Motif scaffolding. Structure first.
Motif, mmCIF file in Angstrom:
data_model
loop_
_atom_site.group_PDB
_atom_site.id
_atom_site.type_symbol
_atom_site.label_atom_id
_atom_site.label_comp_id
_atom_site.label_asym_id
_atom_site.label_seq_id
_atom_site.Cartn_x
_atom_site.Cartn_y
_atom_site.Cartn_z
ATOM 1 N N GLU A 197 0.794 -1.207 0.000
ATOM 2 C CA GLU A 197 0.000 0.000 0.000
ATOM 3 C C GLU A 197 0.833 1.267 0.000
ATOM 4 O OE1 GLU A 197 -3.339 -0.244 2.650
ATOM 5 O OE2 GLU A 197 -3.609 1.941 2.661
ATOM 6 N N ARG A 252 -4.556 10.101 -3.951
ATOM 7 C CA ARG A 252 -4.695 8.820 -4.639
ATOM 8 C C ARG A 252 -3.993 7.747 -3.853
ATOM 9 N NH1 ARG A 252 -2.772 6.621 -10.604
ATOM 10 N NH2 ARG A 252 -4.884 5.999 -11.242
ATOM 11 N N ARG A 295 -8.582 -0.223 -11.459
ATOM 12 C CA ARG A 295 -7.490 -1.187 -11.456
ATOM 13 C C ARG A 295 -6.595 -0.984 -12.691
ATOM 14 N NH1 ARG A 295 -7.690 -6.445 -10.544
ATOM 15 N NH2 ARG A 295 -8.785 -7.288 -8.716
ATOM 16 N N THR A 351 -2.230 -3.539 -9.828
ATOM 17 C CA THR A 351 -2.513 -2.516 -8.833
ATOM 18 C C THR A 351 -3.937 -1.989 -8.850
ATOM 19 O OG1 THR A 351 -0.195 -1.830 -9.072
ATOM 20 C CG2 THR A 351 -1.677 -0.243 -8.011
ATOM 21 N N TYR A 384 -6.419 1.182 -7.217
ATOM 22 C CA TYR A 384 -6.279 2.554 -6.815
ATOM 23 C C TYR A 384 -7.569 3.056 -6.213
ATOM 24 C CZ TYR A 384 -2.535 2.271 -10.318
ATOM 25 O OH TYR A 384 -1.446 1.888 -11.068
ATOM 26 N N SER A 415 -2.813 3.624 -3.578
ATOM 27 C CA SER A 415 -2.559 2.480 -4.464
ATOM 28 C C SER A 415 -2.256 1.239 -3.645
ATOM 29 C CB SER A 415 -1.439 2.758 -5.469
ATOM 30 O OG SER A 415 -0.189 2.875 -4.811
#
Length: 116
Positions: free
Chosen positions: A5, A18, A65, A71, A73, A20
């Motif tokens: 993370e 943001r 994604r 990943t 988000y 991730s």
């Protein structure tokens, strides 16, 4: 599974952040506000077509994604002081969604398969 993370921090009201999570195929973002429980914020299917959002973040947060990067988000826009919390990403298997007695049920039907 291992989840890496990134993101967070201090931001003024109206701002954007943001989060991730780089990687049990369902992905979800949860948050635990001060003195509260860890609650679901947003979730996305292993392809991205299905999304779920808590009503308190609808229209402001967007879960997405990037499959080539493995990943997920969380784009957090129009942030409010109410959004202050510790945020966590979570990956859970298909079976997890179907634990316990939740939702509506059809009338059961018997299926009997007799031997040859």
């Amino acid at each position: 599974v291992q989840l890496v993370e990134s993101g967070g921090g201090l931001v003024q009201a109206g701002g954007s952040l943001r989060l991730s999570c780089a990687a049990n195929y369902y992905m979800g973002w949860f948050r635990q506000a001060p003195g509260k429980e860890r609650d679901i914020v947003a979730a996305i299917s292993w392809s991205g077509g299905s999304t779920y959002y808590a009503d308190s973040v609808k229209g402001r947060f967007t879960i997405s994604r990037d499959n080539a990067k493995n990943t997920v988000y969380l784009q957090m826009n129009s942030l409010k002081p109410e959004d202050t919390a510790v945020y966590y990403c979570n990956a859970r298997s298909g079976g997890s969604a179907w634990q316990g007695d939740f939702g509506s049920w059809g009338q059961g039907t018997q299926v009997t398969v007799s031997s040859h």
